[PDB]
């Protein structure tokens, strides 16, 4: 891993508006299928992602370009699509979020320079 | 602008051409497929066909407008299809791409 301006850019502007967000709150922790009594979860999701396993990995340097960063943003909202049903709330508040997280993209400065 | 330029020529040219990329290029033919509950489960059909036609008649003022548009293309294929069906994989595929290609488009 290392420091970018674009790895920069997704901690301090687009995890900052996510992770406040009022739909927020089931996506800053793994689902716990237990708790959710939901024993097929990891039988259907193989690579489970949440938003507090992304901003630990920012706050660690773990990602070696911003592209890595979005790509688990996009497998965290992807995940809930594939697993929910498609009248279930939880697919309206990632589709929000995720709405927010592609708005913000567009804006990252453009090439990546390590800092 | 500059931004709507590359996701026409660079992040739309690469999906197209992609071997997986033949279910995406037009809408999702419903009676075709037999799939008579598809338009009752997606509200907001999106394909690649539809976002080029966009791209090529200046409909988008702004490069975030195109890419929920991607976005809803691929988040319909997740929702509507199985878990397991090949699609959601050609789906993610492609979904890895536009994501890599987006990293690099100009601010
Ligand atoms: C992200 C995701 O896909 N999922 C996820 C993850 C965490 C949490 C959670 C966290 C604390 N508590 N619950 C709940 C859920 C969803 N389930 C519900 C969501 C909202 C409401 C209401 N109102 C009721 C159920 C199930 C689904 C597998
Ligand atoms: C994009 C999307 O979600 N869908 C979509 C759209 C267009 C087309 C299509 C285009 C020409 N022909 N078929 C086929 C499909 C999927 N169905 C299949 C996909 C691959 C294979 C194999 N091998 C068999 C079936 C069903 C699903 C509703």
């Given at each position: 891993?290392?420091?970018?301006?674009?790895?920069?850019?997704?901690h301090?502007?687009?995890?900052?508006?996510?992770w406040?967000?009022?739909?927020?709150?089931?996506?800053?922790?793994?689902?716990?299928?237990v708790?959710?009594?939901?024993?097929?979860?990891?039988?259907?999701?193989?690579?489970?992602?949440?938003?507090?396993?992304?901003?630990?990995?920012?706050?660690?340097?773990?990602?070696?370009?911003?592209?890595?960063?979005?790509?688990?943003?996009?497998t965290?909202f992807?995940?809930?699509?594939?697993?929910?049903?498609?009248?279930?709330?939880?697919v309206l508040?990632?589709?929000?979020?995720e709405?927010?997280?592609?708005?913000?993209?567009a804006?990252?400065?453009?090439?990546?320079?390590?800092?």
């Amino acid at each position: 891993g290392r420091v970018t301006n674009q790895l920069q850019y997704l901690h301090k502007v687009v995890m900052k508006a996510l992770w406040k967000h009022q739909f927020a709150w089931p996506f800053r922790q793994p689902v716990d299928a237990v708790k959710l009594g939901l024993p097929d979860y990891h039988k259907i999701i193989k690579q489970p992602m949440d938003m507090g396993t992304i901003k630990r990995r920012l706050e660690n340097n773990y990602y070696w370009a911003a592209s890595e960063c979005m790509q688990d943003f996009n497998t965290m909202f992807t995940n809930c699509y594939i697993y929910n049903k498609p009248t279930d709330d939880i697919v309206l508040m990632a589709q929000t979020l995720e709405k927010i997280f592609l708005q913000k993209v567009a804006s990252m400065p453009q090439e990546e320079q390590e800092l």
